[PDB]
Ligand binder design. Structure first.
Ligand code: WRF
Length: 376
């Protein structure tokens, strides 16, 4: 019964992303900044190779259990810490624990579900845990912040974090270090492969699109359309709901459609949607492009996550910690320098021109995905 491992990875991703999306609106309010926001992604980017090597020395369960212990301490510190230095330390600890959870859980899903289609299906659900977490983070945080108090959301998360830990002690039960069998291809060998580079680049550019869109779209809104406070929250809501739907459907569906074709169509759709965003004049005109952006990024992510495991299964040694380190690096590159570069370029040349540049880059990189098809 490997469904318990799937449940634990689903819950770990869900709770990690709930914490990630809950800490966002509260802290500026609690403190009343870019380095604090980017510290999690930077630390995760730095420690991804080390976790990729460590899971090959001691196994997956011990790094996964430590992810809960660091997550529990990070959650407890988040509840009581009121200093910027301690918030930064907690954020970086969350980065280390999220690196452990992401890399080791994706590796254990890939090593437990070795089927090519079941792997896509179960990473569809697991990434759907991430989508559900990003969906219900802000609402849960806001309601429990208004009703009970500032530290109430952190304590409830801490209770389920402990409960995930009890199942983790019951079945993961990592009493002792057990070494893996075979040595993975060095990271340098992995980084010379052009197709792994193309897959990572597609993930990086598609995700950097949304990473620079999400904090810069309201900046355009308050100056052009003068939207009210709730409209900003509801404007990006179709993106999140469509990301949930796209992840859950396309984890199942992209194998039949074709992962290369699904990625290419997602790249074109996100490029055209980003190109059409500057033409919109009101929220009803933004419902369709945001839905398309989220839908297409769901296609791309749910099609390129299993392809990273497929690439090493085809070309290299089948150890997944180190290649999912690269896959997570692709995300962290977009999510680390995203807001800063987006703001800088928007101030320099303009927001519509920035989005046109993103669309052109996406559209021109889309033909590169043609090489990802299987030779037969
Ligand atoms: C890794 N990853 C995190 C978040 C998203 C996301 C998707 C839609 C809306 C907001 C965030 C996508 C991928």
């Amino acid at each position: 019964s490997r469904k318990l491992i799937l449940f634990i990875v689903f819950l770990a991703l869900l709770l990690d992303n709930m914490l990630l999306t809950v800490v966002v609106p509260i802290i500026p309010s609690y403190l009343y900044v870019g380095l604090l926001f980017a510290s999690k992604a930077t630390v995760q980017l730095i420690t991804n190779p080390f976790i990729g090597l460590l899971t090959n020395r001691i196994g997956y369960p011990i790094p996964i259990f430590a992810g809960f212990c660091i997550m529990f301490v990070s959650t407890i510190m988040f509840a009581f810490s009121s200093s910027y230095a301690f918030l930064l330390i907690a954020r970086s600890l969350q980065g280390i624990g999220s690196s452990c959870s992401s890399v080791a859980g994706m590796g254990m899903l890939a090593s437990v579900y070795t089927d090519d289609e079941e792997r896509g299906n179960v990473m569809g659900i697991a990434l759907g845990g991430l989508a559900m977490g990003v969906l219900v983070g802000p609402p849960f945080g806001s309601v429990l912040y208004e009703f009970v108090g500032k530290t109430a959301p952190f304590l409830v998360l801490a209770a389920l974090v402990l409960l995930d830990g009890a199942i983790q002690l019951f079945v993961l039960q990592p009493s002792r270090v057990q070494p893996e069998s075979q040595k993975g291809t060095p990271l340098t060998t992995l980084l010379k492969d052009p197709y792994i580079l193309i897959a990572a680049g597609s993930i990086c550019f598609a995700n950097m699109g949304i990473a620079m869109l999400e904090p810069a779209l309201p900046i355009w809104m308050m100056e052009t359309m003068c939207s009210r406070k709730w409209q900003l929250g509801v404007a990006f809501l179709p993106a999140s709901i469509s990301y949930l739907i796209g992840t859950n459907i396309f984890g199942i569906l992209a194998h039949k459609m074709g992962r290369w074709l699904c990625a290419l169509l997602g790249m074109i759709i996100v490029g055209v949607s980003i190109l059409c965003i500057p033409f919109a004049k009101n929220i009803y005109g933004l419902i369709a492009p945001n839905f398309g952006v989220g839908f297409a990024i769901g296609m791309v992510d749910s099609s390129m996550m299993p392809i990273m495991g497929y690439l090493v299964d085809l070309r290299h040694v089948s150890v997944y910690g180190s290649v999912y380190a690269i896959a997570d690096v692709a995300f962290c590159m977009g999510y680390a320098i995203g807001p800063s570069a987006g703001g800088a370029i928007a101030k320099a040349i303009g927001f519509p021109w920035l989005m046109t540049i993103i669309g052109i880059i996406d559209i021109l990189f889309a033909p590169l995905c043609f090489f990802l098809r299987s030779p037969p």
